[PDB]
Design a protein around this ligand. Structure first.
Ligand SMILES: OC[C@@H]1O[C@@H](OC[C@@H]2O[C@@H](OC[C@@H]3O[C@@H](OC[C@@H]4O[C@@H](OC[C@@H]5O[C@@H](OC[C@@H]6O[C@@H](O)[C@H](O)[C@H]6O)[C@H](O)[C@H]5O)[C@H](O)[C@H]4O)[C@H](O)[C@H]3O)[C@H](O)[C@H]2O)[C@H](O)[C@H]1O
Ligand code: CA
Length: 415
């Protein structure tokens, strides 16, 4: 009888995981058929915006929490409050509250009110270290609790940076962080942010922001605890991490499957290094699972979303397949305490969610074009061809205009 379109994004391992779980779902609901539309993480936002622009919207789909408000105003998302209430036994309250609450909207704020999506997951971005090269080097292991200072972090990265096969060429580096996904921690840890408290002013020219930005770039260009620009060009640092060439690199729970398959060294999680604030910082990501407000099959569509987001047996298969941590708080707590399941300090993930993880800036803004503009022309700063001070001075009014326009578009689309 019922056919359903499901679009989402994922790295190869994530795609395989969700397809198997949709197949479990179909077995449990033999009158529902799910046609899948899946993309790479990169190509995803463009395709969804084209589907929405043409009002050819999938029954069920992934979406950015920072688009909730705009999606609601434009009538993109079905209000699913009652379909989830009347579901069998499902207890959304067992799910992470910061997760579920990203997809609530009472007409004026995102804190409370009706449900317009379910959280796919929470994605704490932890720091990982290669325990195998640390030991082989004779370097004391990092503290599981007490974060490196920036200076300390650079020191160890230096000791980890060397020519190990004695051919005269460096073949191992302390680290190689990707600014797109790892600059936030340093900014936030240094007491800065992309925007102010009100979330209406751009603050990337705060001296604290500049200092963190400069420190990030300097680890490739000045401290040289990084493969060179050319070397990174030859093989990106993600890949070099997988190959065992890097001391440190981030780890999200969506990595665990890929890492099971490729990483041969022992590795574990630690807090991110801390800037002036003394406190570690990093992000906790999330994607929403929403339902087309114009789906012909709201009941069944909500049923597919619930199965992926909260259903005990649907959650279980996704965690088994190592592409996320459990959405149920209590389950994740016993998951984090289970020693048979690597890495050892899985607990760090939860620590990031409860204590020292933050949201992306765009989650507070009506759209994120202002933020995308910061990263669009950032590469010359990363490659040392201009300072952090002069890029952010040049780029701040560009991104204040975009932010002003986003605030204006939310007045206009919501009245
Ligand atoms: O070093 C310079 C760069 O290297 C070259 O690019 C190489 C890159 O390496 C490969 O990427 C490795 C992955 O990247 C990191 O993961 C970051 C992103 O997370 C994954 O999705 C998980 C998903 O996101 C979470 O939520 C995040 C946000 O929160 C919301 O506000 C918003 O909606 C979300 O965006 C969810 O919790 C979770 O489910 C993506 O797959 C990944 O991009 C990890 O280190 C690895 O997973 C890849 O080949 C290249 O991108 C370039 O030359 C240079 O830029
Ligand atoms: Ca060498």
């Amino acid at each position: 009888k019922i056919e359903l379109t499901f679009m989402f994004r994922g790295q190869p391992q994530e795609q395989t995981a969700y397809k198997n779980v949709v197949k479990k779902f179909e077995e449990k609901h033999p009158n529902v058929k799910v046609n899948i539309v899946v993309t790479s993480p990169d190509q995803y936002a463009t395709k969804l915006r084209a589907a929405i622009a043409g009002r050819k919207i999938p029954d069920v789909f992934y979406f950015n929490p920072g688009e909730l408000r705009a999606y609601v105003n434009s009538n993109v998302l079905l209000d699913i409050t009652k379909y989830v209430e009347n579901s069998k036994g499902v207890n959304l309250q067992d799910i992470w509250e910061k997760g579920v609450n990203k997809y609530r909207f009472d007409g004026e704020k995102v804190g409370q009110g009706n449900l317009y999506g379910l959280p796919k997951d929470l994605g704490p971005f932890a720091l990982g270290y290669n325990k195998t090269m640390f030991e082989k080097a004779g370097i004391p292991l990092p503290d599981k609790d007490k974060p490196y200072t920036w200076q300390e972090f650079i020191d160890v990265c230096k000791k980890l940076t060397k020519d190990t096969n004695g051919d005269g060429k460096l073949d191992q580096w302390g680290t190689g962080l990707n600014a797109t996904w790892t600059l936030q921690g340093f900014v936030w840890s240094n007491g800065a942010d992309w925007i102010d408290e009100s979330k209406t002013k751009v603050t990337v020219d705060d001296p604290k922001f500049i200092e963190a930005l400069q420190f990030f770039a300097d680890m490739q260009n000045k401290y040289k605890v990084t493969p060179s620009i050319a070397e990174a060009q030859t093989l990106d640092t993600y890949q070099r991490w997988l190959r065992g060439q890097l001391g440190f690199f981030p780890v999200g729970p969506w990595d665990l499957a890929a890492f099971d398959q490729q990483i041969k060294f022992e590795y574990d999680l630690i807090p991110w290094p801390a800037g002036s604030t003394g406190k570690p910082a990093t992000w906790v990501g999330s994607l929403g699972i929403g339902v087309s407000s114009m789906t012909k099959h709201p009941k069944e569509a909500v049923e597919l979303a619930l199965y992926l987001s909260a259903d005990p047996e649907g959650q279980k298969a996704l965690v088994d397949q190592r592409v996320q941590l459990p959405n149920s708080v209590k389950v994740a707590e016993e998951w984090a305490k289970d020693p048979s399941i690597k890495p050892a300090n899985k607990q760090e993930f939860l620590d990031i969610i409860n204590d020292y993880g933050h949201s992306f800036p765009t989650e507070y803004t009506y759209n994120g074009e202002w933020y995308d503009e910061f990263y669009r022309n950032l590469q010359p700063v990363l490659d040392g061809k201009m300072s952090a001070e002069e890029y952010v001075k040049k780029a701040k009014p560009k991104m204040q205009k975009l932010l002003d326009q986003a605030i204006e578009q939310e007045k206009q689309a919501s009245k």
